[PDB]
A paper describes a structure:
HmuTUV forms an ABC-type heme transporter system, in which [name], HmuU, and HmuV are the heme binding lipoprotein, permease, and ATPase, respectively. [name] consists of two lobes connected with a α-helix, both of which consist of a five-stranded β-sheet and four α-helices.
While two different orientations of heme were observed in [name]-[name], heme was accommodated with a single orientation in H140A- and R242A-[name]. Except for Tyr240, there was little difference in its structure including the conformation of His141 and Arg242 compared with wild-type. His141 was coordinated to the heme iron with 2.2 Å of bond distance. Two water molecules were present in the heme pocket, where Tyr240 is located in wild-type. The oxygen atom of proximal water molecule in [name]-[name] was superimposable to the oxygen atom of Tyr240 in wild-type when comparing two structures. The distances were 2.2 and 2.7 Å between the oxygen atom of proximal water molecule and iron, and between that and the nitrogen atom of the NH group in Arg242, respectively. Ferric [name]-[name] showed the Soret, α, and β peaks at 415, 575 and 540 nm, respectively, which was a typical electronic absorption spectrum of six-coordinate, low-spin (6cLC) heme with a histidine as one axial ligand. The 6cLS state is predominant in [name]-[name], which will be caused by the hydrogen bonding interaction between the heme-bound water and Arg242.
Residue numbers in the entry: 33 to 356
């Protein structure tokens, strides 16, 4: 599907200065993960010690709930061959295959125990990027095999995070194939990013926006803002300022960070009123990025998911950032 995207990248002139670009650039949804197999056959049972130290036996993966903040696990499970086993999702797993699949979070990202248990899951794969913890404890006590992950969520660890998921569902060979394919795709995209990156990198921040009120934050280290921005050839000003979790995107913060580009989730930007609404927020219009109305909007459920589609995300995003 990249045949025409790559022709546009090769065609960009060498004189092109990305600091002169203005306005929104949006990456369209990348879609479903291409599975590495059509006939996955989980080798079960598996016993493991999960990231919280719990001993878990996985003996039935017919009804999976792969749940997290970022949208990673549902995509990896589909990449391994088990998309048809997914029986519920969070709001972050926006991929088309799951669009008719029951949502088990409420009010954004809150786990709902009743919704989960009414789906009669046989395996929950989850991490503490969403909660409450108490709901995770309740479904385990009710009898649902629950596996806590703690993925490294860096570009360098995309492959190991995939291998860890594959080991939970008894598909090590599919895991090795999907890991290697996903890391090769990143490396290929990184060479395009390097060829497109200006000599002085663009300053970026990841701006989280949900609604027209106070859900308006600079995302820090813990969410993976830095890993994405550096993967795009940028400098993450949140990382420069030592933001480990998040910081309010108020006028003082924005003035101090002074990015050249705001990186945002697409539906997040819509929810604050689009570019016009974002430009009304205090401090935005005064930054370099605001003066150029320069926003890179990425599909919400891929933007911080990393995983299998990272390379495609970096390729499309670097074309939007650096190619006119
Ligand atoms: C910090 C407080 C946050 C609140 C109160 C919040 C709330 C919400 C709400 C209410 C939605 C529903 C949007 C819709 O139905 O279209 C949503 C969607 C979403 N959120 Fe959050 N969120 C927060 C943080 C985050 C963070 C840190 C991430 C990082 C991955 C994230 C990722 C997503 C994604 C991927 C979606 C799906 C948007 C879509 O439907 O396309 N959220 N959030």
């Amino acid at each position: 599907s990249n045949g025409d995207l790559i022709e546009e990248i090769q065609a960009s002139s060498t004189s092109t200065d990305p600091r002169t670009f203005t306005g929104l650039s949006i990456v369209e949804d990348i879609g479903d993960v291409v599975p590495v197999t059509d006939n996955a056959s989980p080798a079960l049972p598996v016993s493991l010690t999960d990231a919280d130290g719990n001993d878990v036996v996985v003996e039935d993966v017919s009804r999976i709930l792969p749940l997290d903040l970022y949208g990673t696990y549902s995509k990896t499970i589909a990449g391994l061959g088990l998309v048809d086993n997914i029986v519920g999702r969070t709001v972050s797993s926006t991929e088309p295959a799951l669009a008719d699949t029951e949502v088990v979070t409420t009010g954004g990202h809150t786990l709902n125990a009743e919704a989960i248990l009414n789906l009669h899951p046989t395996l929950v794969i989850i991490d503490h990027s969403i909660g409450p913890r108490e709901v995770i404890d309740q479904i385990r006590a009710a009898g649902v095999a629950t596996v806590i992950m703690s993925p490294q969520r860096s570009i360098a660890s995309i492959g190991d995070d995939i291998r860890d998921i594959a080991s939970v569902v008894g598909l090590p060979e599919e895991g090795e194939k999907l890991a290697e394919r996903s890391v090769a795709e990143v490396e290929e995209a990184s060479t395009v990013v390097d060829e497109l990156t200006p000599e002085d990198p663009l300053k970026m921040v990841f701006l989280a926006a949900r609604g027209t009120g106070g859900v308006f934050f600079i995302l820090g280290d813990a969410y993976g803002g830095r890993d994405l921005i550096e993967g795009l050839g940028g400098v993450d000003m949140a990382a420069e300022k030592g933001i480990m979790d998040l910081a309010p995107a108020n006028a003082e913060a924005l003035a101090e960070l002074n990015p050249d580009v705001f990186v945002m989730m697409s539906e997040g930007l819509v929810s604050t009123g689009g570019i016009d609404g974002l430009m009304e927020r205090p401090g935005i219009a005064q930054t370099t990025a605001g003066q150029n109305q320069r926003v890179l909007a990425l599909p919400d459920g891929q933007s911080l998911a990393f995983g299998a589609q990272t390379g495609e995300l970096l390729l499309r995003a670097s074309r939007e950032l650096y190619v006119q």
